[PDB]
């Protein structure tokens, strides 16, 4: 699906979770789907580096992520400073039918 | 505001522009006029008709006749028509019996409103 050819967030963001050398800026938080946000504005910076969008900040990237809610890609861990989680039981209805 | 013909010459409605974005605050709200004397209080709903996705999603689609002029706070077109394709939107007036005026080539509903390409 067009996640393959053109770069996403969730496809991109998880180049940094799985990779040990980028934990400088994020990490898996636990057994269940969760993730921390280390530098909230170095994160956004590299997403600018890729998107060729130098103006990028958290506020910008973040909004994009808050869209995902209504589409059932990921969801928020309420009250936690900058931690959401991925819905995979829905990424596969969002990448395959029934 | 400005008006246009119908397929029932007893009622008229707004000039809904050529091509617009999926679900926007319309550039001119929707007025629907009663030339035949209608009890100010009668309901009016619209249904987007097109060979493709024959009933599109709409918002604030129901309105109340008042002073012989039913106005829609803000109608919004969600269900897209397709490429080159517009809506023949139906227009109901809830009475005994109810009456309808078809309206061919109403508006082209795409995701982008026409940006300079």
């Amino acid at each position: 699906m067009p996640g393959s050819g053109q770069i996403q967030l969730w496809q991109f963001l998880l180049e940094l979770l799985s990779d040990s050398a980028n934990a400088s800026c994020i990490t898996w938080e636990g057994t269940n789907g969760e993730f921390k946000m280390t530098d909230p504005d170095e994160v956004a910076r590299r997403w600018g580096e890729r998107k060729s969008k130098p103006n990028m900040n958290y506020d910008k990237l973040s909004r994009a992520l808050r869209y995902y809610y209504d589409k059932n890609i990921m969801t928020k861990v309420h009250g936690k400073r900058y931690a959401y989680k991925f819905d995979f039981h829905g990424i596969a209805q969002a990448l395959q039918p029934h | 505001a400005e008006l246009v013909r119908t397929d029932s010459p007893n009622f008229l409605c707004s000039v809904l522009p050529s091509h617009w974005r999926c679900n926007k605050t319309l550039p001119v709200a929707f007025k629907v006029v009663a030339l035949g004397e209608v009890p100010d209080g009668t309901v009016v709903t619209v249904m987007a008709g097109n060979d493709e996705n024959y009933s599109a999603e709409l918002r604030n689609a129901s309105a109340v006749m008042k002073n012989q002029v039913a106005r829609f706070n803000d109608l919004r077109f969600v269900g897209r028509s397709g490429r080159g394709k517009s809506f023949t939107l139906t227009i109901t007036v809830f009475t005994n019996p109810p009456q309808v005026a078809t309206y061919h080539r109403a508006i082209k509903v795409t995701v982008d409103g026409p940006r300079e390409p």
């Binding site: - | 035949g36 249904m47 060979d51 024959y54 009933s55 939107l89 009456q99 005026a101 078809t102």
Partner: protein
Amino acid sequence: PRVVPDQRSKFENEEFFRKLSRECEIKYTGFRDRPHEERQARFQNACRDGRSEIAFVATGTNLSLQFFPPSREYVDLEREAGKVYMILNGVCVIWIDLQRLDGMGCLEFDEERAQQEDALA
């Protein structure tokens, strides 16, 4: 004027009407964003109330219907199992699968009311 002077002519001359004079492909358009189960109940309870929303898929023409002047000859759920049997553009005119929420239907010029209505002028 609720109707056009040549009520019979418009029905037998307008591409719009003759394109709907033949038995066409129709379907229930109510609550499109709802599960097939809810749509089935809503559509049946509503028919029993004497109303619904059906549209000619082929042409794109939608309608909100009222089966009246509860009835008998306007909404019959007996003529067949698993299914059930106005003034359009100034012209007095007159089945869906209870599971598929689709079927066939058409328009028929109303001579009776065409006269009654025309007489009101």
